[PDB]
Subunit: 461 residues, 4 copies
Amino acid sequence: AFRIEKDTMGEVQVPADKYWAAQTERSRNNFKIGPAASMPHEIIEAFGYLKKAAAFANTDLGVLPAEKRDLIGQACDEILARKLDDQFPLVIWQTGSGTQSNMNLNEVIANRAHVINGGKLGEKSIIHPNDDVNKSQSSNDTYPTAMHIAAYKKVVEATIPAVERLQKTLAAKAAEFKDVVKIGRTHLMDATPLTLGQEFSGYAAQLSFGLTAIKNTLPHLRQLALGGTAVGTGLNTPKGYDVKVAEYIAKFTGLPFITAENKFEALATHDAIVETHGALKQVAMSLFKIANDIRLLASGPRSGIGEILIPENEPGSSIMPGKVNPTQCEAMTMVAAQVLGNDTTISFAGSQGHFELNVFKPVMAANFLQSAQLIADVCISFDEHCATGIQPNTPRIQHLLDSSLMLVTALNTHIGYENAAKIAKTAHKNGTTLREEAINLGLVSAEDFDKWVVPADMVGS
Amino acid sequence: MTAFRIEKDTMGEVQVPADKYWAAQTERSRNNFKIGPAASMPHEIIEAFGYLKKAAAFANTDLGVLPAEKRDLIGQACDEILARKLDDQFPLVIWQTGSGTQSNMNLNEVIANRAHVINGGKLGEKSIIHPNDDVNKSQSSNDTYPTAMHIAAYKKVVEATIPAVERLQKTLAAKAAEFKDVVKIGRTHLMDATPLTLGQEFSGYAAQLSFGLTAIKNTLPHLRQLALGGTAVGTGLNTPKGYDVKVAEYIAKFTGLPFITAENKFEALATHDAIVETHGALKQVAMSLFKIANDIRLLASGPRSGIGEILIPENEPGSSIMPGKVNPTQCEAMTMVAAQVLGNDTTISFAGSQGHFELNVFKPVMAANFLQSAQLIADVCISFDEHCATGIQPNTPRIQHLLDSSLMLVTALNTHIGYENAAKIAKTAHKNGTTLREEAINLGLVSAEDFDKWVVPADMVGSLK
Amino acid sequence: AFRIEKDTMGEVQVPADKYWAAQTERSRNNFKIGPAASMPHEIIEAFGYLKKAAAFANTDLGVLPAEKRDLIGQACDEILARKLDDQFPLVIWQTGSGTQSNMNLNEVIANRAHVINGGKLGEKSIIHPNDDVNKSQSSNDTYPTAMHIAAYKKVVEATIPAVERLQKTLAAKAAEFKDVVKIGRTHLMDATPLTLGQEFSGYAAQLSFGLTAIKNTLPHLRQLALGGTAVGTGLNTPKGYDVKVAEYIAKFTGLPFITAENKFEALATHDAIVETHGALKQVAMSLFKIANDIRLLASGPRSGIGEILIPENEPGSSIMPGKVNPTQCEAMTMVAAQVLGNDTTISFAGSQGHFELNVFKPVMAANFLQSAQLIADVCISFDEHCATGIQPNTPRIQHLLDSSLMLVTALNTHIGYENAAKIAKTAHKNGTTLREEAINLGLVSAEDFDKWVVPADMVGSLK
Amino acid sequence: AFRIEKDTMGEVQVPADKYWAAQTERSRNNFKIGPAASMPHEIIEAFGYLKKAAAFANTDLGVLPAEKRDLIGQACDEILARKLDDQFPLVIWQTGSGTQSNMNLNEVIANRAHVINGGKLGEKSIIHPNDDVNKSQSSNDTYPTAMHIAAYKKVVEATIPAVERLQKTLAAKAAEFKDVVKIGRTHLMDATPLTLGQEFSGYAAQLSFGLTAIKNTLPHLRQLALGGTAVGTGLNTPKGYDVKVAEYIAKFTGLPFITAENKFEALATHDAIVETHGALKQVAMSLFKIANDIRLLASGPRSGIGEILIPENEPGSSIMPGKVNPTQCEAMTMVAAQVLGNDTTISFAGSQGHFELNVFKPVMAANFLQSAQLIADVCISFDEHCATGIQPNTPRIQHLLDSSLMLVTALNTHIGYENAAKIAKTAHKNGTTLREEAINLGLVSAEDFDKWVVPADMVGSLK
């Protein structure tokens, strides 16, 4: 049922059918914390790319035979094609450098290479997990490299396109609604007019600024630690490895990775993760506000605001029959709340490096990838199932527009602030219209009032 | 423009502004930590130091290690600090050494020099009361600064914060009783729901503050424990036997508050876990207050194009441009204080994790953030109570219109016709712009008699009859 | 491979073999956010208890036939026995009330009950998901009730016992090490002596205070919303239902649940979750400090502090051969960092209720249960694989103790601060001992020095 | 004494000699929250700039007479010259739009202008606070404009120069110590060598990245809301106002302000403040790490690491005579902890806009300005009083370098990982050196050991 594998600390019984070896099995047993195998699959995929890249670079620089490169490459291709997912059983909550997941890659690739070459599991592998699979490497540069590959891939392939898709919908709605005049609200109180398209133009601008803020963070994020080995010096790397291995990662992923400018910064900190996550959090706070506005505007349908109609996707209540809720808005606001807490966790962890190494790598990686993924997923969901189908509730908009006492603001440059205030305050106290009191107070003729107070003329242009 | 005199410490001579009662170490700190506004160390911490330094002198004299003549001069100088006569003798910032050594020595130097002058001496002479050997006898910064933090924190919470939250809680409970018969429409997800009384809604706000008051009070047993007697590392090195309990007796006497010595002096130096504990309760209260304030501004929104179920006091003009606008400005002040308290909770929690070995050296930043939360919650609860909550009234006609309009009054039919048939009525009323009663009858799903029997808003605010 | 199910909005194609129905399938398709089936299994278990209790209470109060109660109870028992885990496909990131997971329970119970009774999956069930399984209920009171059952269960059955286990080990170490005199460090700089036992007594006291702080929050947490229904009024509940259903949940769970004192507070807020999570976060900040001290004390083995030995459980490096790291300390500090962020999320969500309902329920539930579980798991792991095996490095401790020039502090009450500062500065300049310079300057005699500057006598008050 | 002033709500007793009027006095009395006059003076200063700019733009566009512009400008110049600081008594914790502080500017400028023109305080001003001083404006566009002027000025005139000053010191130290070989530590355990200069080069690179990250946020922060008025539409502004007023603000400040691209974004959000603050917070988490490392490196003198010598600026203890602490490091770590909490507050508030206006403006402004100023001040302090004076403790560095068993890593490419592990583990078990055991195990000759295990050859790539 078990076979014997060895590391420098002794013999370990390993499930006889699994490709991992002693150090993986120790970690599996010694860190029973949270759900099994919680290390993000994106980190394992990133490891497949960088272990293949290291083997290719080592062979080009004359320190690894091509025959060993090809076996390592084949095992990495299998990991990448999702053939060995059950060979990675380790948790986030392991050593803070990710040594144990690095050794999980090294052990699985070594044993699987042995079988690819015609051997049997339980035999000494032709490929050594440390001397061959890990040649010219440490956990300390490989794990950060996996974090930046996985982070950068998710942001450019998932998060940015999802935010762009929603931004384009909001901008399309701003144009669709450019002639719908509604009442502004400030402090939640009745204000002066704006178009529903103007209001949506603010949401669209928020996401355009957010996109720029995320993209600004990509030059730091594309920098890879690989080549810094144990402490950042590149001890035991061949001359030129740092640039050559970054070039192979860029080729295999199709993404613009470069070697990190300062390998001490790249090991002792995750400042690039802090930087990019700050921009994800900025987008999340903007999305919170947009979602919250859309549910306020949709509130009702009879006893709220009710200025917009949203798609009705599912029953909203188990007890209130026929109720429908702004449930896509709720998912977005909850995802935003999660991203803010993830920012606390990443910022705290990012302060806590000691000397040559930040040992909070897995918790920073898992929180980062959750934020990037959930922002991408909820932007797509919100776009598909809410934002694309928003329409005005025109009769309700018109009533709420004509009802505002703060249409009196149009009179300021004709009669002055104090006189205009007396009209609005008198209408409020009496339950009357602005026009009725402008006339009764002797402050504006009926004729001037009708010329001077026109909501369609109060929206700029 | 300054005249000077020479003071010295173990590192050398320092030029000190000639008429100031502080000495070499205060003047070093004043010059070496030009961080934020001058004199930012909270006055409540200086006041707390006045109490504990006087207590230490009384205890030391009772335990035979300080002459009564020196206790008396130390007490006179402490009484001047407590009388707010020496505020200009405390120039140091929050952002100093993280133990507060420099503020401890600010107290020691001012008390030593002011004692010498009270006694008939001249500033510039070596004091008859030594700053380290006499004013600081049986003490460290490491136990005095935490003691000052707990005296100040406990005093603010019991004298200011709790009474202010209690005052607002009582108003909310009074309004829950005042509005017990006012039937309004509930909203869930911001969507029209089933009836509840305005009294019931305010009862929830009142209950939230009752829970939060219990949560703060549960934290006081840890907060009333004082570090004084731990000295350098927690061991009580250089304290007379009995000093820890005796000096806590004197602090309790002078403050009138029930302080006790800490059970574990290592915990009391190496951590500020009591500050983390009590501030988490303040932050709980802040998150409740945010929700209460946000609901009150939603309920008051309009006056014509919002919800407008309640009338709130109109205290000031709301806008510089929109003439006659009035905003729910007390609600805004409360939401902003609550956002501040949550950030203070991040700072305190982070700092509270960062102790090393025998000492947590984030003491001033934990102290300053704690005291800001405790003070702002107290002030904004009083302001909100005085200027908003006591004046809330229902907008009766607007309540009645929004109540009668809800299609979710149909929920009263569920136990009589089932969920699916009730949904048909509400969906059809929605599609046609009609009333529930006219579609129940149009569809033949309910008789007039049963519709009026089963759909009564006043019956929907409790259990089945 | 699909059958047609209906809700009040129309027809839905449902996977033909699944016990869920239209509303579950809509949610599963409309909320493609994060991994599938992310709603915590603890929330589904808590739903099993409360759905069974509601059916039992409804029959007792004459509104649900016993035949329907029995079928609901059997399906709930299967949920509780983890026989139907593949029937709950929905995510955290759904509607913020948990309506869709409530309707997932109601649909799976209704269809499973139909099949238990001899029907075929796909026929309209004998048990209606809204009228029978959900009788006298809303999502708005069931989901908060599931949150409190799951939260209270996890804190009292997992988190508190784990923290108690580690507290007991730290207290035992405080006794084991009571006579080990070591150097204090303040600001990371050499200070005066304390015992290694005293230092561990601090850690043990931190966890004792934290346990009290958690337990103080349990009276609010065991209050259940069940009976508030849609907006807190108990619309469509029989008189007495609130108390009766809480009594059933307390009996089924063996835990002292009661009906909530105020059902408006119980629906419109999750203030009890904020309260209890604040206490978990306090314990987490204490644990971070304890774990960080232990790794600093174990640092080396030759070029660090090195005052303690800890269990060496696994290789530390892929490149530095023979390196071993304080890996259990690292897992605990990373879990602590997670709990602080979870407290930000929970506090932010807790502020954001509107009117009768807080609609951040699933995100508050999932963050809460993560903190409570990870603190339990990491305290057990740390205790087993680190704290139980801590031992002093006897000769290293003695070297660092004898080296501190701040042993001169023992002279203050004999010769004064200034004279002591002179002895320290004289030894430092000359690279001599405190004893040599105290005798050299005639400030203290050999016999007085050897009686007065004894590290073992510097770990308590005078006398 | 008092005088009666009036607003549209009624009569108010105002302190008789003060230039403010009814609305300032209402706010002063209605918001007794925290210490008086807490609204940041940088916001008042930014208001002086923008009110003068608005008057100039209004006169150019023919809606304000030049005689009123000139009086408004003279009063704004007095505010800018810090002559009227006692005329601004309001708190942060006022209305969330800052209406009351906008009206404080309007009232003080109107009344001071009347007095400058030869009138008596308490008469009706020749300049109306709303119709003249606030012509073409709202609180809703003026207060965000004040926020961005203040924020941008503080970042580019204070925060960036201060961080640049420390970055350049850390880069100079990286170069000074480029040949000082010391031991690396990973997980706090003995690792392989790096130069003290390499270690400093990491700190210098962290602040270079953070400076780039702050500067990336400046294009959004330089955008001004002014011209949006009440809801973003520019109601009651003359054609061309938005661009002209920005041009006057840029001229008066000397800073590259422009009008905001979208006035709805500029009123309904403070997303630029969230963006820039996130960058301040990134720098703060880097500074925390740098300061913590410097105190760990300085720790001792005997009980710690003690690889560097730092300036000794003051006594460290009231009780331990001669102790000196890394106090500049402590101030920096405390500021950094403040900045992270400030980021929680700003992020939370940034999410909380409703419809056309975010009404958390004062709390966002005050937390932003505190972060920007404290980062500036503590970087200057740490540079002057610590970083500029760091030097190596040469023999301590050499002892800790030579002591590391992970120097064995030099052998990996000669004998393999497993044989290198056998040498280090055997030295550890026997309490012997790597060299003794490499020879005793027969794995490496003395001559090969001496040629291969050379720390100065382990700080870069293979030859």
